[PDB]
């Protein structure tokens, strides 16, 4: 179903009106809190001394109704950015008055318009109201997709509408927001209600509002086409847009009167409900991850830390990845043990980070599928998990599997391995220290041994999400650097965001790394062609790995393994956002740094502007060895 609201500017009887919108089928109501035409004076006698009441009473609805059903609207006569001093001062007072009454009623949200370039003093007044007593009040800025000025009919004889390609001119409306938002220093309390006019703009303009905090999408009854029967509908392009906004789960607001006078107000609402319920129903990935959207989480360190039962459980609850691991082994066996040698030759096969043993069970299924002998080690550092293995080893596997309970770096193995099998790959691949781990465990690999995987590779994409930028900025904690939260990565199901360039590869690792100058430290420069006027907030992190030959795993969206939920993207944010002009190159630099004990990333932006070097000397984020 869809969360739908009715926008009115005329409310005769608030009891009746709200009674009607409810029956029509709306979840809430936007209404003016004071009468919209009832201008008020605060300075000049005799109008200031106007007898009250200034507005209808609070007792007209339950506190619940005010808290759940009513969105407040700033009266349209209030003009805090007027050129006229007196109108400013008066509008300032009126604006606080209406905001403060809104907060008195405990209203979920309050509406304010952007419909002009200079909204400075409006931001200033709101920013004050906000920074005046912490309160759950929410603010919907009403921003039009296309300026009124650029939508007007070309009917003015001496000021015509210019028919010349205006790339930045058609983005002007978003700059309004950006500036306002920026003056209010990225308040969590300030979102966008996006007003959608009859003529959509170019894709590239609608692409701007990706990664912007859209709590609402306003649809005037105008923009609706009329069909064969008489019902309201929308252009195929308007629909695509709705389907884009339904994925952000916006509240849909219906403004303007009923121009389909042969139906109800059901009609408009019902078309929306029909659109939403005939959308590509959720795939394996989307369905599983439906809670974790733009949810920041610290990246796991299965080395330094021991994972929990239910942590290991969701790793195992991913069938595709283990089919792939099983196949990968299946092939390697055949390639290694000739058909004729099948019974005379057993393979020494060592899982390195065996967890609760889904790779061990995969290693079994793979062997009897490929009819070759295997002896299994299951090396595991985490002694809580080792309990689970030894309980499998005893009950079901028997002495085929030899459960080893040490660090694969430490272990003094009895024989050498044909195949080592590791799953110790994070979301940026090398961010759990597979390279350091499998380097330490290399000395007991047979001189001709295979690693599964043998190659893995990390990928960065620049992204814009003032939303996720606000999520990270909200991770500041007492008793550490106040910006520390920007100098560390987060595993997040990136949702409300915008990819600005196609992912390029960052760091690649090989196993066995036979090189005599083994050095897992790195410096990779990346140059990202950008083709929009957007704002940089951080870098999406993905990975691909070769398990063995044509069997691979990827979370890199383009080559993404189908139906594989063991992994979400990582996100390297940056402190100050960076404006990027169209056709400019984003240059980001990455280092993999290491001493005896820690492994960390440092990262900087060198273009278009220079950023500050993030996480110098792993001071804000290290990975324990």
């Amino acid at each position: 179903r869809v969360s739908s609201g009715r926008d009115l500017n005329c409310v005769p009887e608030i009891a009746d009106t709200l009674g009607a919108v409810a029956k029509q089928g709306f979840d809430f109501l936007c209404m003016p809190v004071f009468h919209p035409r009832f201008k008020r004076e605060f300075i000049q006698e005799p109008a200031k001394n106007r007898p009250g009441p200034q507005t209808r009473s609070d007792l007209l609805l339950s506190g619940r109704d005010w808290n759940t059903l009513i969105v407040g609207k700033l009266s349209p006569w209030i003009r805090p950015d007027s050129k006229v001093e007196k109108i400013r001062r008066n509008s300032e007072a009126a604006m606080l008055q209406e905001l403060n009454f809104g907060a008195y009623l405990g209203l979920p949200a309050f509406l304010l318009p952007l419909n002009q370039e200079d909204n400075t003093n409006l931001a200033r007044v709101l920013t004050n109201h906000i920074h005046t007593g912490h309160h759950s009040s929410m603010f919907w800025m009403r921003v039009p997709l296309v300026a009124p000025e650029d939508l007007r009919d070309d009917i003015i004889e001496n000021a015509p509408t210019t028919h010349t390609e205006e790339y930045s001119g058609e983005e002007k409306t978003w700059m309004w927001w950006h500036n306002f938002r920026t003056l209010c220093d990225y308040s969590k309390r300030i979102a966008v209600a996006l007003e959608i006019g009859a003529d959509l703009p170019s894709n590239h303009v609608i692409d701007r509002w990706l990664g912007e905090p859209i709590k609402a999408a306003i649809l005037p009854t105008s923009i609706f086409l009329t069909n064969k029967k008489g019902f309201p509908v929308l252009s195929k392009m308007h629909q695509r847009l709705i389907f884009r906004l339904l994925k952000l789960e916006v509240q849909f607001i219906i403004t303007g009167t009923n121009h389909h006078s042969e139906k109800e107000f059901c009609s408009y609402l019902q078309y929306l409900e029909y659109l939403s319920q005939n959308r590509p129903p959720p795939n394996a990935y989307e369905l599983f991850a439906k809670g974790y959207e733009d949810y920041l989480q610290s990246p796991l360190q299965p080395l330094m830390d021991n994972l929990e039962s239910q942590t290991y459980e969701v790793f195992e609850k991913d069938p595709i990845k283990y089919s792939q691991y099983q196949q990968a082994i299946y092939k390697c066996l055949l390639d290694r043990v000739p058909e004729e040698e099948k019974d005379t030759n057993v393979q020494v096969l060592m899982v390195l980070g065996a967890g609760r043993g889904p790779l061990v069970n995969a290693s079994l299924r793979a062997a009897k599928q490929a009819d070759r002998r295997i002896k299994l080690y299951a090396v595991e550092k985490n002694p809580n998990a080792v309990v689970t293995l030894e309980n499998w080893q005893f009950e079901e596997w028997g002495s085929q599997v030899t459960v080893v309970s040490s660090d694969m770096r430490e272990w003094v193995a009895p024989e050498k391995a044909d195949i080592i099998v590791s799953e110790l790959l994070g979301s940026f691949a090398d961010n759990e220290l597979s390279p350091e781990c499998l380097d330490g465990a290399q000395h007991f690999l047979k001189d001709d041994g295979v690693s599964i995987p043998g190659e893995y590779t990390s990928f960065l994409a620049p992204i814009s999400s003032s939303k996720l930028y606000n999520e990270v900025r909200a991770c500041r904690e007492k008793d550490r650097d106040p910006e520390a939260q920007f100098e560390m990565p987060y595993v997040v199901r990136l949702h409300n965001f915008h990819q600005l360039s196609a992912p390029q590869p960052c760091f690649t690792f090989s196993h066995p790394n036979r090189d005599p100058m083994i050095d897992n430290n790195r410096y990779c420069t990346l140059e990202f062609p950008v083709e929009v006027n957007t704002v940089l907030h951080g870098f999406a992190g993905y990975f691909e790995t070769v398990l063995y030959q044509d069997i691979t795993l990827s979370i890199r969206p383009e080559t993404h393994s189908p139906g594989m939920f063991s992994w979400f993207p990582i996100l390297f944010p940056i402190k100050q956002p960076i404006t990027v002009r169209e056709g400019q190159t984003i240059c980001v630099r990455f280092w993999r740094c290491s001493n005896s004990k820690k492994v960390w990333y440092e990262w900087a932006v060198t273009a278009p502007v220079c950023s500050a070097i993030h996480n110098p000397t792993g001071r804000s984020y290290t990975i324990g060895l």
Binding site: C10, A47, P53, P76, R152, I156, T257, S261
Partner: protein, 301 residues
């Protein structure tokens, strides 16, 4: 309904009053008729009265029986006076605007009318067929005032919060035409056509400056700082060489000569001065209303 919005004298000494409630439980509106113009605003000594669905923002006569309403609902309403002028029955109610209808104006003919709104659209109505002929999104902001040419139907003014003043002519392919002072002056608020020089008009701005404009010359010939605040309405006298009544949000009426100099000034109102009409019987009597529910009668030297 304490907030009286419109005050229009008929061509027979009778008085029309348009009121909205801009506070309290109910945000409604009414239309009243007073065959005794000195007996207002008293509800008990009124010839005829009716409650609209919702408020009135602007109100004009449509001849001798007809009343044209700009409702907050977005509806333009036509109210036919009774056979015996005792009742005020709805002729038509037509929801064609998508916000408050802020202004209405009847065209020289009087079987057609224009209507400005807060949705930025202007519309031309057939009051006979009861449908919208034309729908024009000229402006970049909510339509402050529309005023029909007194003599030509196709021609009329609209001004708006986009700081534009548009001279219209519904006979062209590009009907609207942007005019006014040299630079972008403060916002226009009210538009009075000159009764006896259809070439010229006056516009009131938001900073209390009434200006005089010649369409021919398309240049600001004269302008005066009349009020401290916004100019909400401008009505010319039926006088041979007419006076100009300027309303304001500073709760003062001023009456001006042809050269825009202050003849009369009234502090009678203690809230906003909303509308004003001259008496067609005595041309030196002028009836102003306000949101103070006062109906003051001015004797104009």
């Amino acid at each position: 309904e304490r907030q009286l919005e419109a005050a229009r004298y008929r061509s027979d000494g009778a008085l029309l009053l348009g009121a909205s409630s801009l506070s309290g439980r109910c945000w409604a509106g009414s239309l009243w008729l007073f065959k005794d113009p000195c007996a207002a605003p008293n509800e008990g000594f009124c010839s005829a009265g009716v409650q609209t669905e919702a408020g009135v923002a602007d109100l004009t006569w449509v001849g001798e029986r007809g009343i044209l309403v700009a409702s907050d609902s977005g509806a333009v309403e036509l109210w036919e006076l009774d056979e015996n002028e005792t009742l005020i029955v709805s002729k038509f109610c037509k929801y064609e605007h998508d916000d408050i209808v802020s202004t209405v104006s009847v065209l020289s003919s009087g079987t057609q009318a224009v209507s400005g709104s807060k949705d930025i659209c202007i519309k031309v109505w057939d009051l006979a067929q009861q449908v919208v002929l034309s729908s024009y999104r000229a402006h970049a902001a909510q339509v402050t005032c529309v005023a029909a040419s007194p003599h030509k139907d196709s021609v009329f003014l609209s001004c708006s919060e986009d700081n534009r003043i548009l001279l219209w002519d519904t006979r062209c392919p590009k009907p609207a035409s942007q005019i006014g002072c040299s630079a972008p002056g403060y916002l226009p608020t009210s538009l009075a056509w000159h009764p006896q020089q259809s070439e010229v008009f006056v516009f009131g701005d938001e900073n209390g400056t009434v200006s005089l404009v010649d369409t021919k010359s398309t240049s600001c010939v004269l302008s005066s700082a009349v009020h401290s605040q916004c100019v909400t309405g401008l009505v010319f006298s039926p006088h041979s060489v007419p006076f100009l009544a300027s309303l304001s949000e500073d709760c003062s009426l001023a009456v001006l000569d042809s050269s825009l100099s202050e003849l009369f000034r009234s502090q009678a109102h203690r809230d906003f001065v909303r509308d004003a009409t001259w008496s067609p019987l005595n041309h030196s009597l002028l009836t102003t209303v306000g949101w103070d529910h006062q109906v003051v009668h001015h004797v104009v030297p």
